[PDB]
Amino acid sequence: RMYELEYPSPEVSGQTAGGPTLIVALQGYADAGHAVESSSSHLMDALDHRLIASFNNDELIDYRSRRPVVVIEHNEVTSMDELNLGLHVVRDNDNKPFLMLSGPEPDLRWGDFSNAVVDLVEKFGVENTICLYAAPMTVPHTRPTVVTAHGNSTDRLKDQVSTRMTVPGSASLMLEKLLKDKGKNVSGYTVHVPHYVSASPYPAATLKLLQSIADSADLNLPLLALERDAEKVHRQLMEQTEESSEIQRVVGALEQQYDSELERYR
Amino acid sequence: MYELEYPSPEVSGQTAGGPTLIVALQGYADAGHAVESSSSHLMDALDHRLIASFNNDELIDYRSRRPVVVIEHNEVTSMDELNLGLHVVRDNDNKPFLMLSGPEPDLRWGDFSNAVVDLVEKFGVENTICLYAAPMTVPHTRPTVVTAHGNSTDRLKDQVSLDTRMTVPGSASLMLEKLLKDKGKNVSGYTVHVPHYVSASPYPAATLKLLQSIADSADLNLPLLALERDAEKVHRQLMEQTEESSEIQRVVGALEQQYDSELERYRNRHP
Amino acid sequence: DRMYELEYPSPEVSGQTAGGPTLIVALQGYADAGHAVESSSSHLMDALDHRLIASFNNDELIDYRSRRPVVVIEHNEVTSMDELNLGLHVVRDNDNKPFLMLSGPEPDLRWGDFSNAVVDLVEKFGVENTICLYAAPMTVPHTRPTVVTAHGNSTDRLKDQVSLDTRMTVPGSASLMLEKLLKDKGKNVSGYTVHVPHYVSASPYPAATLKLLQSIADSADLNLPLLALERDAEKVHRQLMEQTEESSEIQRVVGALEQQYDSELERYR
């Protein structure tokens, strides 16, 4: 109803025993630096992936809301963004399998959607689920990207800066709560991206999320291109900041906040 | 569209005759937060039992609403269920009435208003009252007015509802009103008028007004006293602010004049 | 299928001309500069005999809190609620030649189902060509002729058009999904986009409506009554000519656009 199983079904074959981890990367909720969507597209570009299930966008999408992009060329509609919301099996650089659910966060039917996904985690013997978030924070581009973690399998992440807070709901948050309630392992990882940079792609944040997954799911992920991309935008941001004194004042101010907060947390 | 609660609550009734239904849907006319405050006040203050729960998967655009989630101790501890439910509520004398409250549906207004009419039949409801709070050009320094529309408006004694022809944006409750009418049923909509410049923050005098209009026309005994305290406290914050400013004092006095003038026209036309 | 209900009894669709009807698609909510899409359907509906063939189910298609269809309260009663009908009609021109029109709200929901349903109706009624209508805010002055561009595969039916053209990315619409589906099924389909002065776009611009309906009249070979739009265009133009001499900043903005236009009118042709 929510989704359709691919035929024939791809095999999730671990030469490694123990269930795969599931990575949830839904675009439309917390997309600072485009880090969440950049995470899934990067893995898809660099690794062998196979489609397991496609969700039905007619059950799930408010299209006047999303207006999937159309290409007109040679005077005809040549292309419309399909906005695939799909479950994949992806092989890391050792061919170790993991699962990815990526695409648009649904507009609709969050209850049925999260039940569908929980059914899928049971069907594929998933042992951990990690959801990805990218949040704009009062931080400078001159300090390391911080990740915070919530959930019951947070222990698996070695680089982590983790009080009571109230946030707008998201499909992935409903999903986490449902997994928790069912006694399954589940975390959400949120990368903190400088607010003055959140509207644009910010590769350091994508890198940080992917490093967090590589570490806690024990995956061998190819991340060197994103390191170079991060180098580039950083060199770029440094000109923009050195060619102006008022920006140069905010960054020092934010660095001080960060370094002072760093001691406090340590 | 909904699920009936099991085991069902026995909504009688001795107290002969059918209950009235109160419709308090958040998302349409929420000036001073007065619709949601009315229902949540009754819920906190009176005994209530759940009768039916609507299915949010049929009814809600969750990316528009984003029901709030709490994270504490590195754990997702709660998520607002956004329950749109029908309740049996009992006043201070244990007299039953019905309340439909929760979010105005984003979707399926046709199936929704039809499901609601099957429920009013199911429960032998005899009158339906929908609540609205509108921002108006009225001052905080004058009593809160409620206007009425429908076919059972007669049951509301105090209502400065000198009306003409107007076109408003549609709502799920207005659709439901039109369907109850067309089906031959008793239905009214009460709008409380809230100073426009205070409409974004809680304005308890309006909640109070909506509730006493309901107590009046449905013959209910409601505990209202915490809302009186609240109203006096917001009034004082408002006095203090208008006090600081001659520009604001000028704006309030002009609304006061407008208000008094229309009140004259109203009593002249309503001996 | 669940998207719509066929009217019963079924209206008369046949004409005296061989080959099937042209279908005009006019969905409000996507490209509405000058209100020219919605004025296209309602101008024709007011002028011509029309008959309902099918209504789409708004509960399947509509986010009502985003549309909030207008309610009339008078004599302290709810008298009226806009039904926001999305309907397929058979319309007759002034020679009584039939054509088809799908008009009303662009759906919020179920674009895949919606466009499959429309293709079904296209086949059921032997539609030979489908034209979708768009009105876009553009950097053109109100002092120069309104232009239409066309994209699709039946584009040549339209004599007077500044298309063709080349590569662009636009937000998607229900009519764009449908165009693509009709293209992928080997059918005839075009989209006509009227260019409306950006500074005038939030208000009615009848000249845009007129250009749209003339484009249809020429390319579907329909005898459409359009004179009332010429008179509406005159009224709105005068009102704009007045507004242009009361304000001197407005005159520079218009004067700049005028040359941008007239240049590229010659420069690139």
Side-chain angles (χ1 to χ4, degrees), chain A residues 1-242 244-266, chain B residues 1-243 245-271, chain C residues 1-245 247-269:
Chain A
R1 17 215 201 232
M2 274 321 105
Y3 67 85
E4 188 86 23
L5 247 18
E6 222 55 36
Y7 186 93
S9 187
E11 192 58 43
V12 187
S13 37
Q15 273 224 187
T16 68
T21 117
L22 173 66
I23 286 96
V24 174
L26 302 175
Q27 197 278 332
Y29 174 56
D31 302 309
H34 308 227
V36 172
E37 180 189 31
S38 294
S39 290
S40 59
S41 70
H42 184 267
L43 294 168
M44 220 90 83
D45 288 346
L47 301 168
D48 179 74
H49 47 93
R50 292 157 211 200
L51 190 54
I52 296 175
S54 271
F55 287 79
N56 191 344
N57 281 0
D58 282 1
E59 302 293 320
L60 295 167
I61 297 302
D62 179 329
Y63 291 88
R64 282 182 79 252
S65 211
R66 307 280 208 145
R67 319 207 79 124
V69 158
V70 164
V71 173
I72 297 148
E73 71 187 314
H74 302 124
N75 260 76
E76 290 196 77
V77 181
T78 52
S79 208
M80 182 157 199
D81 185 347
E82 275 174 36
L83 272 198
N84 189 59
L85 167 59
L87 182 58
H88 294 88
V89 55
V90 188
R91 312 239 140 210
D92 77 0
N93 283 330
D94 302 314
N95 248 222
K96 182 183 178 190
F98 65 96
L99 265 36
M100 197 170 225
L101 170 67
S102 74
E105 170 189 41
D107 301 285
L108 306 180
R109 299 231 159 236
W110 284 10
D112 287 333
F113 176 72
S114 59
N115 287 335
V117 172
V118 170
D119 287 351
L120 288 157
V121 330
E122 295 181 337
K123 195 172 217 156
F124 291 85
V126 166
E127 90 79 41
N128 189 217
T129 302
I130 304 165
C131 303
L132 317 187
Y133 307 87
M137 299 294 258
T138 49
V139 289
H141 72 283
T142 46
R143 289 293 185 267
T145 303
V146 154
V147 167
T148 61
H150 58 74
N152 60 18
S153 60
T154 270
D155 28 290
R156 307 186 185 198
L157 178 56
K158 289 163 165 148
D159 180 1
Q160 179 194 338
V161 202
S162 279
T163 63
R164 188 208 207 257
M165 76 204 87
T166 203
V167 298
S170 83
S172 64
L173 292 165
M174 181 173 298
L175 170 61
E176 297 191 49
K177 192 176 149 263
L178 194 57
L179 292 163
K180 180 183 81 85
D181 286 350
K182 260 141 177 183
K184 319 258 164 278
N185 298 313
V186 65
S187 294
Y189 305 168
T190 308
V191 68
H192 310 172
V193 179
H195 67 274
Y196 58 88
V197 103
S198 288
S200 286
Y202 192 81
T206 306
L207 185 67
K208 199 53 181 171
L209 283 169
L210 293 181
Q211 302 183 134
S212 298
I213 284 151
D215 169 40
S216 66
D218 183 36
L219 297 169
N220 184 14
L221 306 180
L223 302 187
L224 286 156
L226 283 175
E227 284 210 351
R228 300 180 290 269
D229 293 341
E231 264 145 23
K232 193 145 204 87
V233 334
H234 177 70
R235 293 189 311 249
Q236 185 173 0
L237 250 14
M238 291 311 252
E239 347 248 44
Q240 181 192 308
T241 209
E242 181 57 60
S244 186
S245 75
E246 198 201 333
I247 314 169
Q248 210 165 330
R249 201 196 193 161
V250 182
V251 174
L254 280 169
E255 277 162 335
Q256 289 162 49
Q257 188 168 3
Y258 190 108
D259 293 342
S260 139
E261 195 59 48
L262 198 47
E263 274 189 315
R264 275 196 284 270
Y265 169 79
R266 297 167 177 194
Chain B
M1 225 62 6
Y2 61 87
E3 206 52 64
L4 285 166
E5 191 80 355
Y6 182 95
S8 182
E10 183 66 71
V11 177
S12 76
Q14 87 304 308
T15 327
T20 131
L21 173 67
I22 305 164
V23 169
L25 305 178
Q26 189 193 338
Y28 175 57
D30 302 301
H33 302 247
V35 171
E36 49 269 55
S37 292
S38 296
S39 68
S40 86
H41 181 258
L42 292 176
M43 220 96 78
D44 288 347
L46 292 168
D47 296 314
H48 55 90
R49 292 295 107 83
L50 188 58
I51 290 175
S53 282
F54 288 77
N55 185 1
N56 284 5
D57 283 353
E58 293 294 318
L59 292 169
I60 302 299
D61 182 325
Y62 292 85
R63 282 178 84 257
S64 327
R65 312 300 200 129
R66 296 209 178 278
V68 176
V69 302
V70 183
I71 290 148
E72 65 177 311
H73 318 303
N74 264 50
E75 203 78 40
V76 171
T77 61
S78 69
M79 188 158 183
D80 178 2
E81 270 185 40
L82 265 211
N83 178 72
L84 176 64
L86 183 61
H87 298 88
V88 51
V89 188
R90 286 162 195 281
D91 72 8
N92 285 330
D93 299 306
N94 197 69
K95 187 183 160 156
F97 63 102
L98 262 42
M99 181 159 246
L100 177 69
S101 68
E104 169 182 48
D106 297 279
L107 318 172
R108 296 220 163 253
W109 286 5
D111 299 336
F112 176 72
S113 73
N114 288 297
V116 175
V117 332
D118 301 327
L119 287 167
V120 336
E121 263 134 29
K122 197 73 197 83
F123 285 89
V125 167
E126 91 84 33
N127 186 224
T128 300
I129 309 184
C130 299
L131 309 185
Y132 305 88
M136 297 299 199
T137 50
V138 295
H140 74 273
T141 49
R142 290 291 186 272
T144 297
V145 163
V146 162
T147 52
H149 59 76
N151 66 17
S152 55
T153 173
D154 28 87
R155 321 180 177 200
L156 189 67
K157 198 87 159 55
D158 181 41
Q159 136 232 211
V160 162
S161 73
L162 208 40
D163 263 35
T164 59
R165 174 189 210 270
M166 73 192 104
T167 60
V168 303
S171 82
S173 62
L174 287 161
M175 186 175 292
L176 163 65
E177 286 195 59
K178 212 188 160 304
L179 183 65
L180 281 161
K181 176 182 83 99
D182 293 355
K183 268 163 181 260
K185 260 83 123 185
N186 292 329
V187 61
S188 298
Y190 302 168
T191 311
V192 66
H193 294 210
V194 177
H196 66 287
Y197 53 96
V198 94
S199 265
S201 306
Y203 195 73
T207 309
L208 191 56
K209 196 53 214 274
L210 284 170
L211 288 184
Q212 65 205 356
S213 307
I214 287 158
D216 170 22
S217 34
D219 193 22
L220 305 161
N221 172 6
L222 303 176
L224 289 180
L225 314 164
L227 279 174
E228 278 160 327
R229 184 231 162 243
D230 289 359
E232 294 164 354
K233 170 96 161 293
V234 30
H235 191 69
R236 295 191 295 266
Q237 302 167 305
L238 258 15
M239 287 171 103
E240 188 183 1
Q241 264 146 25
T242 157
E243 187 54 56
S245 179
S246 80
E247 191 144 292
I248 296 175
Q249 276 149 213
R250 157 145 42 270
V251 165
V252 176
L255 299 164
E256 285 175 359
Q257 216 182 16
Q258 174 170 133
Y259 186 101
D260 292 329
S261 196
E262 200 16 89
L263 181 65
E264 294 184 38
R265 287 184 289 283
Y266 194 80
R267 26 174 205 113
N268 209 279
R269 291 156 171 162
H270 303 276
Chain C
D1 185 78
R2 200 212 275 283
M3 290 312 91
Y4 67 86
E5 203 51 64
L6 246 24
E7 205 60 24
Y8 195 84
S10 193
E12 199 46 65
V13 163
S14 67
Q16 296 302 112
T17 336
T22 293
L23 169 67
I24 287 53
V25 172
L27 299 178
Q28 142 109 45
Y30 174 59
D32 294 321
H35 301 95
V37 172
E38 47 258 69
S39 294
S40 296
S41 51
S42 88
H43 181 273
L44 298 174
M45 219 95 76
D46 292 354
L48 300 172
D49 313 292
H50 54 89
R51 285 145 178 98
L52 187 73
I53 296 175
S55 359
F56 284 81
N57 182 350
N58 283 4
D59 275 8
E60 296 290 324
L61 296 165
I62 296 297
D63 183 319
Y64 289 94
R65 283 183 76 257
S66 62
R67 307 298 201 120
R68 319 212 74 121
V70 165
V71 170
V72 176
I73 293 150
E74 79 185 293
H75 302 119
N76 298 78
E77 200 90 35
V78 180
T79 37
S80 202
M81 190 166 183
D82 187 4
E83 235 178 274
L84 260 209
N85 184 66
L86 176 57
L88 176 73
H89 289 85
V90 56
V91 199
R92 300 278 173 171
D93 78 353
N94 277 335
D95 307 314
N96 208 239
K97 176 164 163 174
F99 60 100
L100 258 37
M101 190 168 224
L102 179 72
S103 64
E106 166 189 46
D108 303 284
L109 315 175
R110 299 229 156 231
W111 283 12
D113 289 336
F114 175 66
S115 55
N116 296 343
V118 183
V119 171
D120 286 356
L121 293 161
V122 158
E123 279 162 4
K124 170 169 183 98
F125 289 103
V127 173
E128 71 109 354
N129 188 216
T130 296
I131 308 167
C132 302
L133 309 183
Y134 304 91
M138 296 294 182
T139 52
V140 292
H142 71 271
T143 55
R144 292 308 189 277
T146 297
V147 141
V148 153
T149 42
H151 61 79
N153 67 21
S154 45
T155 258
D156 294 332
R157 290 184 197 206
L158 177 56
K159 278 134 172 193
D160 177 23
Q161 46 152 312
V162 75
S163 40
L164 17 106
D165 58 72
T166 112
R167 185 196 195 264
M168 54 189 146
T169 294
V170 294
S173 78
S175 57
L176 289 170
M177 190 178 277
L178 168 70
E179 290 183 44
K180 185 175 188 308
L181 186 57
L182 289 163
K183 174 188 151 244
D184 293 347
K185 280 164 167 270
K187 317 275 196 191
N188 290 322
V189 57
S190 300
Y192 295 176
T193 305
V194 75
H195 293 32
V196 176
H198 65 282
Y199 60 86
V200 108
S201 288
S203 285
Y205 199 72
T209 311
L210 181 65
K211 195 56 172 182
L212 281 179
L213 298 173
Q214 281 169 330
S215 304
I216 290 166
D218 150 39
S219 61
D221 184 30
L222 298 174
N223 173 11
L224 308 178
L226 296 186
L227 308 169
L229 287 163
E230 312 211 325
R231 81 183 75 98
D232 294 355
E234 274 162 42
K235 181 214 267 282
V236 70
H237 180 74
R238 299 193 305 259
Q239 239 169 323
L240 257 18
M241 282 320 279
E242 290 178 20
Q243 204 172 324
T244 206
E245 33 225 20
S247 172
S248 214
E249 189 174 294
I250 291 176
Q251 192 199 300
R252 188 175 324 284
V253 179
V254 173
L257 289 164
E258 277 194 10
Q259 264 302 318
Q260 223 201 340
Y261 189 108
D262 287 41
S263 144
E264 306 217 293
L265 156 71
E266 169 230 355
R267 180 198 163 182
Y268 193 66
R269 159 203 41 82

